[model samples]
Target: MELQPQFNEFLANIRPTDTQKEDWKSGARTLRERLKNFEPLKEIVVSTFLQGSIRRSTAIRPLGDKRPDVDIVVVTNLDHTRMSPTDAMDLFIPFLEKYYPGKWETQGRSFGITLSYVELDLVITAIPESGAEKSHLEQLYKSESVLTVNSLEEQTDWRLNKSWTPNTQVEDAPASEWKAHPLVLPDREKNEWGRTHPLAQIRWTAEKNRLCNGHYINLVRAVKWWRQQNSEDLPKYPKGYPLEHLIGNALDNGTTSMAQGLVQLMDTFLSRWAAIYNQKSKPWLSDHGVAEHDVMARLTAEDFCSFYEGIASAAEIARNALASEEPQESAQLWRQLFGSKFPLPG
Candidate 1:
């Protein structure tokens, strides 16, 4: 009743196409090159790297007329202690005006640039330790080759926290040498700097996918598509990365198939939400690498209840699909939950 083939078709339908991937990579690479060459940032820009859904391979194809987006982290050498958040952000206004012109706008913690081909986010960070300059730069460059446009190549070399390297067969290298501390980025709205460990998040997702027998990211994609199809009545706060984080937390290791993984994930979320539905405060969901910041801080208790009901109903449908004895019956049940992308029984 797992309907492995049907799940594969669904996943393929939801995953971003090669053209979308190319657009994301081209946008990120161009922005990184521009930032490095910018006169004001030439001396202070420590490293620029790609982050978020594309980097993590958790991105789904945008529905309808929506276009794909990417995030770029610009690490700088500025001192956070003396520089105000607004002052730090103002340094890039000239660069944006010259390059993106009328296409960009200032965001709370980053700059949002809307391009005809793909959308981009520039997350500028300050206060990287002087000691980490060497390793940070090395890893930043390593990402260029490892995070390739081809998903298969990335799976082979892009992950593993302590023992992964591009040249393990030739020479041994210390894993700790590549590790870098979390960096702080300015938040203009909050008038402060916040810590985000993007490398840690990337590593965690890659490792999780490996442990789940290469099915974790696809599971995320399927659930995300289901949410998109039913976005009309659901709360959007836990929609993007926050929802991905919740899925990662609920999914167990050694999940062999997408059918079981999706069912288990939704059921786990329902049980967890049930325990907290009556509580006055929302549950504290920490970021993968940064423990101090809560990923679910913005989801209100009222929204949480509505979100909970959505997931609970979905979970029951998933369970029924899993329990069905006939293949056609199972496929139909799944199609009901995931729309037409989940193909009918052949």
Candidate 2:
């Protein structure tokens, strides 16, 4: 497969635009400051920072009509033990009403802000009781890393396979520093509190970045761009983070080149799909902060089968794209995966 130059072209073209970055930063800053100033939300607002693709530096530029929800974690000083998942989430409603007007939605744990250009999410978490000081969040923002959720011991149930070695592992923070589980959001329909720990997942991506010489995130960006192209046809596909974590867990994503890495990730994913898709005991992404929490927790049996077939097809096209000798011909194969936003075959 002729992988050079063209794969680099794909990577270069798949990035979030300069305007998108500004809009994100502008939206995030407005939300944080407005949140800090509101009388009701002030003391409750502990800290705010980025997470997900932007934080991981694997940001993707969406195709037509797709709105990616960028995450901003806001830690509150309230005692989660004393509150309902809805309690902390409720505090932000009236404030959003005053500022964003009708542009926001109370989606599960996060208040999803649908702006003119993009959707911004305010993911709420409460400070642990012992560490829940009003100003305890002061040190959290000075660094670029996401907040590492405090916890004890490894959540063995969360690991998909111990056979998968850590491609990268972060040095643990001081044991005394981490506190408790992140705030839970009550699922009104199911009447349950959903538990997740994003900080640990973010760190894990960083480690993968280090292991792959930054090629891992580019592989993620390229793969996700392909996923974005399918969002319309494959409307019921698995969520974005599962794909992110799946790539993060897979070893040796052809780090020699971004184009080569794309094929290896798909090859690895397809090889492992059977074991992971139809599990004897359902496996989960190993969350360092929460036991039994998984990125693929939401996929149904039917959807999983569909997703499996879809991935194999994706890998085949990617393989063909790499193998094609003509520049425009190879680019055309990639166009099938990445869509109209990508460069047209010359």
Candidate 3:
């Protein structure tokens, strides 16, 4: 049974509450306003925009007294080559002190600001190596929605994707001429620059969701909720984007419902684990836009052991739930996997 209605209940349970959503939106606007108008940051800061799970619509309610967090990227004119990572990061101290004060703490690659309502991740990035990509960066920052930029090609064009009519979808839009490069960010701990392509990630996710009959994001959310519930048994390395990437890679087009997506996803991972166990190799997951970067590079074979074992059990439960013919039986099995979130049919 697909259990379509039950899946709806599960997603609703996992979704952030209205109050949390309002806090995120208001907090984002306030932070953006602060960055745009701040005297110290105004000159060098190129653009400030929302990124990460919140921007991608893949965010779920955090577990156990955890507040929701949003990622904000600040593009600046600072040259990565000229400045040390500490120096580049230090430039923002005044801004943080004036606004966030003691509420913020320095993170590996960004400053984390915690408020009563929500948490903010301030990710500062170096400017585009190619001057041509600046306008597209600003354009992406301005429009809250990625779908507004039509066409498969222009949507994927980092440098190539740009210029669109408001509220219009052009199926055969012209492809961009220039290939956009990934944005560079300072890794304070590593004392190095790293590549991130938020635009590409957004565009890719949108396309994937379209291809999967709009069930991709929901699938991501469902699995993310499950991960949070089973966090103790799972490896820590693949929790966020890495886990999402794996889920995206596992799911194919034409997924009918959440139950089917979950079964297929777990089955896919199980099969991959089988191969990994036989081959004695860690799974290599490519980052969406940045092909060279491995999202799973940090994951070890030992961690894979734990991940595989946990999913093995969940896969069995999901399979049983998916195959159960009786309504009560199906819902019960689903509840076992998803906890109380899997609502009983009325």
Candidate 4:
């Protein structure tokens, strides 16, 4: 497969700016202010902040000269009372509509509130209490850090200076001043609280960015090669795999923490696929002459489709293996696929 110069140009185009950074902070503050007045939500609003590019301090260059919208998550205590997703949605929707008005829209169980000048996505999640079981919810909040300019800047700097290799081992420097802010309610004892720690929240934000960035990198690279091989017809199968469905199922079913586990899985898949493809293709062609290379050139659309299909097929087999058996049998299959070294806990 020939490498398209456009892909290299795409990588070069990714840059952030100061205006975008401030806009995120401004939007976050606005969201916090607007959410405070909702009566059914007053006690429920635990914490909120910008989580994507602004959180990563990587908005120096907006995607297509337009500032990226901020992702604002409003952690609340709605789950503390065993409120259903539908019930929580009902209570928060009117408040969003009244205050934010046309700026917001409801989806699934969450609300996407977009202001006139800025886009703020409001996601309502239950706050994890101190002594609650360490399930998916707790696991997700455990890694989040409070949003801050310094934290975002530091993460962006690390990515720029580091090697361009795609992998989960990329280290994000710790932000000295980033820490969770306490969410205090009137008349509530200071000892009892419901909210995510700032540090934990920030970590979640960073991890999510890392996963998305990795996916984009892989997609861009694949697209580059696709454009080179069949400039007339772009291949599209790699982008439509059922990978997200598997991750979503695991998350919704409480089998794993949605944010952390899903991101980790994406990173692992991309890194491994990249490594394997590079090893096999050797697009640089340092080993064989240009004439010899013509016979064994880069992968075609069929090659990409077949390889990814095998991966999807394996995933399906693993899923069925886990289901068509007793608990022990399913456990064994999980161990075999995920690694027997990490045995299933009793």
Candidate 5:
């Protein structure tokens, strides 16, 4: 069982504690039931579900903290075209305020709230270009006009003021959904529904995990940990969700051995990076989950330089770990990539 126990030891350290997992479930359930039963929201909210790491089960302690970040999307029946971002907020915020009853924040697309232990980012969902004649999933499959909302035509930059009330918000901005794709998030700064596909990403990652014998997601968690750890030493680096899909692409149906899997994973990763290095263009990760959404779009050239540099160093270490004859040495190299979470090689 050589590297087998090494993998389990690493898993034991990185896996979210049972209490954290329980809080995730109970928090989601509480919100779902609250919105459904809450008088103001019940009429409008269609459903609620976890997004990002919460949906993927790749959630680890946030950088420098132990509390898990819980992102919940409350799908609403509102017309994103007709309703301004402010209007949408007005409709959504009251329920959160009335129930949660604390210092709620106007955090761009989602209203940020904190339960006793969990940080909840509650985003209200609006379908772009509300329609059915075209078949809801038609555009995604056929590559037709994207599913959208009226986010560009009317938008709002209403901000957070500690001593705030609804009266302060300006009812302004245009519909910007459907233009790109998916449920576009409303950005207060740009005042548009930025193209995004939280649901599709969840679906895509789940499918990839199933196809890869359920190891793909765990592999992603390991790398995401590396990415976060790198942040402590470097200015910036690769992100989580896109990297999840990146691993999904390379790790499909590979050796079941975690050690061998890392070997193949790093090999494919460098293969992709090698091409990017050849191009000398700023790194951009096209979110397979969200069409046209470059997850790495925000990274600068210097950011990419730092990113590629760190990735190469880690990849080399992981490769050596895979090749080392001694299990203890191999495990130590694994620790270099995943840090303290990886158990010492036996």
Candidate 6:
């Protein structure tokens, strides 16, 4: 429904054709049978398909030839009394290597395994029996809300007007301006904690953008748009400033404290990034992108590395300042460096 053209292009590139779907089904069946035969994994319930694109049914046209990767969720009701998600992965890795080894790599925290050849990803998450854990499980199985072309068209009138209005920034607008349609969660009442958090909404919107557009630029753009609109107070950030911003700030200031502050800020920023990514698929931003590599082939790696090292050096200075015991000088330097008005050492 009135989607961005670039997003449309991405969808077109990855959409699966009829023959491809058949091929996927055949591969899926084989994988399923293999998993079933594995004695340790026999009890796990496996669901196969493209989770973000196909699950959302927003895959672009030319539907027959494109074959995106498949996602496999190994759901189990077993009592993980002694095992955390990490522990479960530790146990699962050896099993997978001995049997299903080949192109499979266990991602950080060991929550999922990716097989790049088949473009397949297998995730293992526990389904708790009761309490908040049970509620979270139910929510994971629920379907997501999506905008139809007609619906997007209808919303476009207001969205476009507001977006382009002279002197009206995205952040200046109310939160309702960016609010998404209510999505269905399998256990709506049970997963109330997630629903109540603003961060959850941000994560959801990021995911929606990724699925609809097949890239996270829109999500980044939205956040940037929102920042441009609002100038009241610094909007609560998910964590650190965007990588570009951090690099720019470090270069501009060229002070050790300023650099260190940026590093601490980045650590905070990444925590939010990880939280959002864990809950849903979104565009990933890494220090490496801004620190080591160029956005495209044209950017030099040396420049990025210098920018990051500067930030790291500054962050260390900041840590030292915070650890200082001198009263008057320390207080003054802290206030000047951090822009804090109140005494922070209490």
lDDT, candidate 5, 1-346, per-residue tens: 2377777777667766666666766777777778779886766766576666756666666655546777776666677777766677778667767877774787877788776666777776666644672244232322211111111101122211112223224211121322234764576465555556765565455556655655666677777778876678664545755466556666747457676676777777667777676566555667864656667676666766666666677778877888888877877788878887788754
Kindly report which residue stretches of model 6 are placed more than 4 angstroms away from their true locations once superposed: 1-14, 17-23, 44-50, 59-69, 109-117, 130-346
TM-score quality measure for candidate 1: 0.88
Better of 3 and 5 by TM-score: 3
Clashing pairs in 1: none
lDDT-best of 2 and 6:
2
lDDT of 6 by residue, 223-247 (tens): 2222232323332332123432332
Question: Lowest summed lDDT over 10 consecutive residues: which window, candidate 1?
Answer: 166-175
Better of 2 and 5 by TM-score: 5
Please give, for residues 262-331, the per-residue lDDT of candidate 3 as tens digits. Answer: 8998898888669885665678877887789888887788777777788899999999998999888999
Rank order (by TM-score, best first)? 3, 1, 5, 2, 4, 6
Model 2 scores a C-alpha lDDT of 0.64
Assess each prediction's global lDDT (C-alpha) against the native.
Answer: 0.76, 0.64, 0.75, 0.41, 0.62, 0.36
Off by more than 4 A, model 5: 63-65, 129-181, 249-255
How well does candidate 1 score on lDDT at residue 162? 28
Clashes of each: 0, 0, 2, 22, 21, 18
Query: Candidate 1's error at 154, in angstroms?
Result: 4.0
| Candidate 4 local Cα displacement, residue 221, angstroms | 12
Which wins on lDDT, candidate 3 or candidate 4? 3
Relative to the true structure, candidate 1 has a C-alpha RMSD (angstroms) of 3.2
Listed per candidate, the RMSD to the true structure in angstroms reads: 3.2, 7.4, 3.9, 19.2, 11.5, 19.1
Higher-ranked by TM-score: 3 or 6: 3
Rate residue 20 of model 1 by lDDT.
73
Off by over 4 Å in 2: 65-67, 129-138, 141-193, 230-235, 251-254, 275-283, 324-329, 340-346
Looking at model 3, report the run of 10 residues with the lowest lDDT sum: 149-158
- Give per-residue lDDT, candidate 1, residue 344: 78
